[PDB]
Design a protein around this ligand. Structure first.
Ligand SMILES: CCCCCCCCOCCOCCOCCOCCO
Ligand SMILES: CCCCCCCCOCCOCCOCCOCCO
Ligand SMILES: CCCCCCCCOCCOCCOCCOCCO
Ligand SMILES: CCCCCCCCOCCOCCOCCOCCO
Lengths: 442, 442, 444, 443
């Protein structure tokens, strides 16, 4: 937990010096740590995942210098916000900077000119097209666009998905609002400190790590299906009515199960492995629930159907699926390539090809600044998958939304559209008779 | 075994008389039998499988009136060549005609004009674009195209793949040559007789039926993978050095096992079902081996891998594959939709989605007409698969040739090309160390 | 005469060279050897190629006689025995003799339509491999029969370098006559036409009344030139058959409409453009009934006077007709000769707009007769692919005058071609309706 | 004087309507209201829109003074405070007064480029949403800065209906002068120009010498008319440089260009009497400061070139002299509306458009805005989308004469445009190399 002792590079201060030299980061900045970048961070960075969270603030009481100051303080409190991402010596790494001055990009618009249209212009015109996270310049930056009277302002926060996740992003907002409202905040832990905790929980002799033994056992016997080799990102949507969840059964479990029966039909298998997304926050850590970073992980989820004389109800799969999740809670946090390297005979660089992600997170957002201020949320976002298929479930109050995201070369529009409906129809089926033997709908 | 004993319609001699008035068949023809069209026959008809077998004849000794006579003689001999195909009362059926006068289409070319070029023009111009087998006009027809001296003549025989297969097509040529050479031929059984023999061979009760008992146990607890969502017929080729065959092993086994390993990686299955072509000539009747028609069958082939605690050599697989074939010999001749209806849960109209066909048949062809004459073979062919992928293998002297044929929407050129290279690669690996245990591919 | 117009020293050793490559029959003789006209090379360069098809249904039909008719008709029309070649880039006619005609014959399956067979041969090989300047004989016969020979198709293939509108019906009346052994008059070779054209030429050109006419005719004229420009397009617009003012011909009315279209677009009061003439005003004998391509494509100059002169449609009309009638005696000479002898223009200057009024037979016959009675219907297959030029064809049927524009899509796009056809249509009809109007027409 | 020429009964209720829609500032006055000229309306229908970009790199820069220079300049030039609209069918200028200029300002991130930002705004919203006839003031300023104000890009946006080649350098020199607080000799409106044109015109139109000159000038003429051509289509620019032409004694570079075209046209049209469009500066009116006032006084008028019959044996020199006087003859008459030329002096439809316009760029091709020491570099962004017409522009740089062709790809395909540029180019060179040649000449 002593700084610079997880660096894969030995003169870390000299990599700092060079970025400064190159005017890639501020030259008055200090290097307060240097750690490996995680697999899940790289997943995002490699997919150009980049957000611009925008807050349209209207009202007479807005304090502009305080807005500016809040940005600085937000960054002082969250070291993930002070982090540069770089590859050095074949190592993907993150650099924690301190003594970091935040400078807001400001725009005083012409009369009648819409603040948001200006942001959308900066965004489309240079902000994401020239995005180069691995060049080492901070992804996290602020923009202030104000009509002339300052009674209609848009504040934006740009950030790489390597720096937040669904559980902690709301904490970024409430922190910001609290800092602007002058509400004292409790001290917090860094994403770096999560990394060090991951590492302290590991044995130096891998064959003695309960985690990598659990995975070796969880996965012994198993074979993961591999798509036959495969140009734009495609998002495809299907809404259903929110399905009834028998006691003990998580909505996530439903989706993970409905996918497994889909994959059992289409593969010739009763032993399917596919990727799903875990929050990575089931560690014995202080602040684990609140710290800001990307502790999300993408891990193997094995669903196993019985020989077949066994007359499984839907419910039998439901409980089994859940167990194939909950079994791994204390082991869900390791690097995916580690699991492959230590618990399997699979190439460690083996990619997941399908990734199921249920969104049991906040689906609406809030930034309650005080005077009276109307504050409205919107975002811009990029996300470009490689060869994998993402299935996203969003549990709203009116609907579950099945979302498929994949490159068109991996899954064409009609394939995407069918996969949506197939997964939905099964979720529904599981909901309409959890009792039925698995002899359904296809 | 009486005629019409297998007709699924009740007035056969009136469907006949209907066709004659629509001028679909010769009015002076007689209807001798009427039977169900085989499932595999329909496979080809549905795919517009149509050949023009072309014989280029050069020499001074040619008897034109004898060539014409021989065409007629050949049709009197083989009833499948006297068969019209129609659909009626929801039923796919085949009408056997007699008192059928064979009329040749004849072309007297201009000096300098190439008869083959004329053939090609009629082929691409009308013959195959207007092809409508199920309308009920005879698929089998002859064309004679002559340079003015009758010393360069192309003879042409058209035919649906529903009326021949790989083993019996040479019989058609050899008989043709015998007839023209006035060489006496022995009595031959008809394709119909083949069908009457399948019925006699079966019991009226189905679980009772040992063939459907053997499949039920062959396919018990088996799951056959189903491709995701369903352009142009694309043919794709890769030829390798003819692999060496360990003692006991057929080339067909080497290919079938290479496909199973391939599908076991991609499906993450130890239990793979896929389609494959059998000659369907293991029934014991007289002339089974020599009768003209399509007795090809497409049937499930199941390959089962053990846990790798067993540690299979390649050889263990080869032997298992071969055995998963040889087991079904006495049962391989039944309708596929019957196998599904009677031995499985599976929907009976379940399509094979992959079909592996090893061409252990004649690959070169001869028509030794006598005077001296030069007689050269060539062909025109149509074939348009549906949603399935065919893998064909041709064991020539200088190369094993792997050939993939599928619609481009089912499998795109880049993929097809990879499939070809991959299967070839596994075949080749199987050949250079049959003893190796399962690793390394591909 | 023969061979006096041969642009090669050894004709017989070009014929032998061809016989030796199996381009023409080995038993054939070379009987004349002349230049192909400029008009002939126009059609050849555009791959202009026709299959004239006769559907014959009936009991009394004599296949053997049909075959002989083919041979004899070719016998009497030397253009039908002509093969085309280039030798020093300047295409020539080899007239053949001792020419055995061999019909291509098809006996169809029962049920097989004979026309579909012909059509398949046409698209499958006959035109796609056409190579007239290779030397093989363009004129060739096909006979496709249903098995009882009571329904046949006869097809005559031919290059447009071997026929024109006025003489094609002769080919049909001759065929029918030969078959019925009805007696026929004697007739002239197309080659006779060529010889006659030259006979009337002056041995030196600045003296030739023809090239003197053309010099005066085009004196002052500038012919407009398209700016730089891949499929042949045909575009049609039918209008009510126009009323013709007294003395004014239909063709004149079409050509005046165009002239006016052009003067407006060019902002010119003196337009020159191409138009087709029949080339059969030469006073030779049997001029109007021989068989070949006597067509010529020549300049038509239309000069509008200043606006103070106050011209009526009628004035434009008479002048237009006059600008045609004036050239009758001189319209038969090579265009490239008109240019180099009578003007300042490059000899190889192409005509870029060609107006052709079809004042010829538009429907045809083959009264084969038969010993019960033969029913013979006409139809045809045709290729024609313009180069950089635009054609305007008018077609005067009973119920419509069909304005036809043909031109490569790269030259005149579909929507322009539609506008051209419509505009020319409108001007015409507008002329018909009020011939006394002043040239203050609305139109565009 | 003000509100003369106003083609609407109630001008101030049109300024009212605009203000109560926040199209223009509520606190602004309607100082004048006039017709928009035909040439102005040409540029507007074609979306002609410029951003003039000054990159200032230096120590001494005064940001507050920059803002104010913006204000003063707009005060000085009434065309800069003009808004454009279409009422009663026809497009008109509203001149505004008591108009406060609001500069758009951007303080960039560290290491973020000012110009990349302007560019982003330009393509992101500035031109794609342009709507001049909607009434918003097309003239508007932008200042984008690096965080120490030692690096700034000022931009000026403007419609081509507000400037032309002779007066744009004035805009720049006036700005610098204001910035530097160098005093300035007063100037006239663009509005002054309009009021003058009406003053010098006669009221019985058949009595106006201008329209008698044009009637006589175009007497007997027919202008050729394009055929169609249609197919959307893209604006193409095509360039061909040639060696700067040696000029024959007494002949200008512009005559050289227009004679080449005439010769090109007479050949393709097969015509000895050709009429085509060409651009005049419109600054020959005798008026105070005609040469300095800021606006678009440009006009597009007929140039008629008449070749005699061959027996006359014209030389290239004859064509050059004739062509030049076909221009100098019209100098005093060049300032009237094209549509008025056609209505009053010909029998051609008044709304007849020119289909070919030649414009010789005998104006400044480089620019300046000179303010420790400030380094001030020029660049620009620009839109322009022609309709059915073809433009030919010639640009007389030191190393090359640039023949530029502009026309929608539907009117002239890339291939034709390239050939046009090469043909005209080649004719110019030929004329230059052998001006005594007879017009019966080779390539
Ligand atoms: C056979 C149709 C499958 C459609 C392709 C879906 C595109 C991406 O899917 C990724 C999931 O991959 C796991 C499934 O593996 C299938 C392997 O198929 C090989 C049989 O040829
Ligand atoms: C994968 C390329 C498509 C090849 C054509 C079909 C080949 C027939 O093999 C069937 C086995 O394929 C399994 C289907 O895979 C579906 C699972 O993935 C679909 C969505 O993730
Ligand atoms: C840069 C403008 C080009 C100059 C005008 C050229 C117009 C050519 O004169 C037309 C005479 O040509 C008649 C035949 O052209 C048919 C092509 O039509 C295509 C477009 O008009
Ligand atoms: C010549 C191709 C179009 C070039 C762009 C338009 C140039 C405008 O110049 C107009 C002068 O051309 C008028 C002549 O147009 C020819 C009309 O007749 C051709 C037959 O359609």
């Amino acid at each position: 937990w002593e700084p610079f002792s997880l660096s894969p590079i030995k003169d870390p201060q000299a990599l700092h010096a060079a970025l400064c030299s190159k005017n890639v980061i501020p030259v008055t900045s200090t290097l307060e740590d240097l750690l490996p970048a995680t697999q899940a961070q790289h997943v995002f960075i490699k997919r150009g995942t980049f957000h611009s969270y925008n807050w349209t603030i209207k009202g007479r009481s807005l304090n502009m210098d305080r807005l500016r100051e809040t940005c600085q303080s937000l960054v002082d409190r969250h070291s993930i916000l002070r982090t540069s991402f770089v590859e050095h010596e074949g190592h993907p790494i993150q650099l924690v900077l301190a003594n970091l001055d935040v400078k807001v990009r400001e725009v005083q618009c012409w009369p009648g000119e819409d603040p948001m249209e200006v942001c959308k212009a900066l965004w489309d015109g240079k902000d994401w097209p020239t995005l180069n996270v691995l060049g080492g310049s901070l992804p996290v930056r602020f923009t202030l666009v104000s009509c002339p009277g300052n009674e209609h302002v848009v504040l934006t926060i740009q950030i790489s998905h390597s720096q937040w996740d669904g559980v902690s992003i709301p904490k970024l907002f409430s922190d910001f609002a609290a800092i602007y409202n002058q509400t004292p905040l409790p001290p917090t832990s860094d994403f770096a400190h999560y990394l060090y905790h991951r590492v302290s929980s590991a044995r130096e002799d891998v064959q003695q790590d309960p985690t990598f033994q659990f995975w070796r056992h969880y996965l012994d016997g198993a074979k993961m299906a591999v798509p036959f080799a495969p140009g734009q990102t495609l998002w495809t949507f299907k809404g259903i009515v929110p399905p009834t969840l028998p006691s003990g059964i998580t909505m996530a479990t439903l989706v993970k199960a409905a996918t497994a029966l889909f994959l059992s039909y289409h593969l010739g298998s009763r032993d399917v492995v596919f990727g799903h997304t875990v929050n990575g926050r089931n560690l014995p850590m202080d602040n684990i629930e609140s710290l800001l970073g990307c502790t999300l992980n993408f891990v193997p989820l094995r669903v196993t159907f019985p020989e077949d004389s066994t007359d499984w109800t839907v419910m039998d799969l439901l409980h089994h699926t859940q167990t194939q999740y909950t079994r791994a809670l204390s082991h869900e946090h390791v690097e995916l390539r580690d699991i492959f390297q230590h618990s399997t005979n699979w190439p460690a660089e083996t990619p997941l090809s399908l990734i199921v992600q249920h969104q049991n997170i906040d689906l609406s957002f809030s930034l309650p600044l005080r005077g009276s201020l109307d504050v409205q949320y919107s975002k811009f976002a990029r996300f470009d998958p490689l060869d994998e298929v993402w299935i996203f479930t969003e549990p709203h109050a009116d609907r579950l939304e099945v979302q498929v995201c994949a490159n068109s070369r991996v899954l064409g529009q009609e394939q995407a559209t069918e996969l949506a409906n197939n997964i939905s129809a099964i979720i529904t089926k599981f909901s309409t008779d959890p009792t039925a033997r698995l002899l359904d709908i296809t």
